[PDB]
From a paper:
The resulting data was used to obtain a cryo-EM reconstruction at 3.1 Å global resolution, which allowed us to build an atomic model of the [name] [name] S-layer. Amino acid residues 33–445 could be reliably modeled into the cryo-EM map, which was sufficient to visualize the S-layer lattice contacts. The missing N-terminal residues of [name] (residues 1–32) are predicted to form a signal peptide for Sec-dependent secretion and are presumably cleaved off and not present in the mature SLP that forms the S-layer lattice. At the other end of the [name] protein sequence, the missing C-terminal residues (446–498) were previously shown to be important for cell envelope anchoring and are also predicted by bioinformatic analyses to form an anchoring segment on cells. Due to detergent (SDS) treatment during S-layer purification, this anchoring segment was likely detached from the MM and remained too flexible to be resolved in our cryo-EM analysis. Both the trimeric and hexameric interfaces are formed by a combination of hydrophilic and hydrophobic interactions, including salt bridges and π-stacking of aromatic side chains.
Corynebacteria belong to the bacterial family Mycobacteriaceae, which is characterized by a highly unusual cell envelope with an outer membrane consisting of mycolic acids, called mycomembrane. The [name] MM is further coated with an S-layer made of the [name] protein, which adds another level of complexity to this unusual cell envelope that is incompletely understood at the ultrastructural and molecular levels. Our structure shows that the S-layer of [name] is composed of a hexagonal array of the [name] protein, which interacts directly with the mycomembrane via an anchoring segment containing a coiled-coil motif. [name] is an SLP composed entirely of α-helices, an unusual feature among prokaryotic S-layers.
Numbering used by the authors:
A (entry chain E): 33 to 445
B (entry chain F): 400 to 445
C (entry chain F): 300 to 349
D (entry chain F): 51 to 150
The structure:
């Protein structure tokens, strides 16, 4: 049950029912295009000039302008139908934006998980390597010219920080492995034992071999985590979640404005329709057509408030499409999404107690209307039923009396 | 006010259904009685 | 609040006393916001005493 | 509800009362933002602005408040039984002291 007028509660034709939001990547350009496809419809309404509104949303008609009320009613009905369709599209825009936001959250969640795993692996390798380096350095008797004195790993890029860079550390580890493999081959020479001031001993080779084996065992496990971290950090940089939140806010404001636009058009259509009509009954000391005319002053303020909100909602997107303060210090952060979500939810909660003021008046007038229309059928229905019942009762009684006369004449014979 | 409206918007339907059933049963009984009277008429007229 | 939100565009939102049923619920908040203030003022001393 | 003289320790009373007093900190503060942040669930990561989700969240908050009220109901009987026991013990004590 769903129409411009309905008695079935929440409706999907307006954007009030529940809808799932799987993580599906809808590009921000798609959001911008879909939102601008509707924002062009509201330029005349947001301007506020009545002449522009009547020129844009109302059709002039045949070259010879017909001033009869029927053409005016038809034009208003067409405008109302167009507004209804625009509202139907703005409904689906919301779900599109929500799915985009969900995907944008999932990607950088996975990216930061992978980064943490890779950093932990690097920290473990750093913990494991250094003691063997010290042990091998302690067991050296050469002059230190070709077989140099080793230095502690990660001398520049401090890995123990929470969010440091991690490529220079890997390159330093690779360079250390290369240096170890280079210095290992000179241990196989024949004239390395030059003199007492520089020579080799028995325990240098086992230490060097153990260090090389540990490095080779660590790198083999380090590699896949580095690859996954790089791949996932590159992917999460191709989507921002803040602009999608802004688009969601803008589309919600657009739907809110389209609601009152449709309400105004429907009110005008119904007011024009009830001209000199049989259904224009009188209630509460006034005519039914009179009740509709009183709705405009409140709508002209509620729509003003909605347009004031939508103007800021529109201006926010244009100035913050691709610029700093929308992307932040690192690839994954929820300290900014949470605050904006909180503010948006608070604004959504607050606005549900404002539109209801005019919603209840519209519901009151509409309720008067369908109550009168539906009550002006039950008398006729019951009258027809009672007439049929009485006719059937009389017919049955008459035929029974005829049957009694029949048996009378039969057994009297 | 709420539960008064909600509960009052069922008795009309209940009474309408009851009255329709009562009228249908009354008509059915009257028709079958008239048929029985025609039956005895045709039987003893034979 | 739950019942006010529930009656949005509903079939059961009948009109009585020159107002809609959903309108009647909205008028309860100003009195509750003072009664709860009084109860909280009592509860603050009740908590501080212990 | 009856209140037999049963000894419930004052530490039990303090713990049972603080288990409810934590629920009212946001309400007793009076800030609407804190109230909506504490007693209302935000929901799915993609904030649904439809009225149905708002209705569901308000219903959940109402149910939570109902359960809290149900527990605060039994706290009263616990405290009353504790008071009755505390009166009985020193009544007997002073009777014995007078006799001696």
């Amino acid at each position: 049950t769903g129409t411009y007028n309905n008695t079935g509660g929440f409706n999907d034709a307006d954007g009030s029912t529940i809808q799932p939001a799987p993580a599906v990547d809808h590009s921000e350009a798609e959001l911008r295009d879909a939102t601008d496809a509707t924002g062009n419809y509201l330029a005349a309404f947001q301007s506020g000039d009545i002449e522009a509104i009547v020129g844009a949303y109302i059709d002039a008609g045949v070259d010879g302008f017909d001033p009869s009320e029927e053409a005016i009613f038809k034009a208003f009905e067409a405008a109302r139908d167009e507004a209804t369709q625009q509202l139907a599209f703005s409904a689906e825009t919301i779900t599109k934006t929500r799915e985009s936001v969900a995907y944008a959250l999932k990607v950088d969640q996975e990216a930061t998980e992978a980064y943490l795993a890779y950093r932990n692996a690097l920290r473990g390798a750093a913990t494991s390597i250094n003691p063997l380096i010290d042990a091998a350095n302690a067991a050296n008797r050469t002059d230190g010219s070709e077989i140099e004195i080793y230095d502690n790993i990660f001398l520049a890029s401090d890995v123990f920080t929470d969010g440091p860079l991690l490529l220079p550390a890997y390159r330093e580890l690779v360079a250390l492995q290369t240096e170890v493999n280079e210095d290992l081959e000179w241990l196989g020479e024949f004239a390395i034992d030059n003199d007492a001031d520089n020579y080799v001993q028995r325990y240098h080779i086992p230490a060097v071999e153990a260090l090389k084996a540990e490095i080779d065992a660590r790198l083999e496990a380090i590699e896949p985590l580095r690859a996954d971290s790089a791949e996932k950090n590159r992917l999460a940089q191709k989507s921002d979640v803040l602009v999608r939140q802004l688009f969601l806010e803008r589309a919600t404001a657009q739907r809110d404005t389209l609601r009152i636009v449709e309400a105004i058009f429907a009110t005008a259509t119904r007011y024009v329709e009830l001209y000199e009509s049989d259904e224009d009954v009188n209630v509460e000391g006034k005519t039914l057509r009179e009740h509709y005319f009183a709705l405009f002053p409140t709508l002209f303020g509620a729509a003003s408030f909605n347009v004031g909100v939508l103007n800021t909602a529109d201006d926010a997107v244009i100035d913050y499409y691709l610029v700093w303060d929308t992307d932040l210090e690192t690839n994954d952060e929820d300290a900014a999404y949470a605050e904006e979500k909180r503010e948006f939810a608070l604004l959504t909660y607050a606005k549900i107690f404002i539109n209801g003021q005019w919603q209840e008046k519209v519901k009151y007038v509409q309720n008067l209307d369908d109550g009168a229309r539906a009550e002006a059928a039950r008398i006729e229905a019951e009258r027809l039923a009672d007439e049929a019942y009485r006719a059937e009762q009389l017919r049955i009684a008459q035929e029974a009396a005829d049957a009694q006369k029949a048996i009378a004449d039969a057994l009297a014979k």
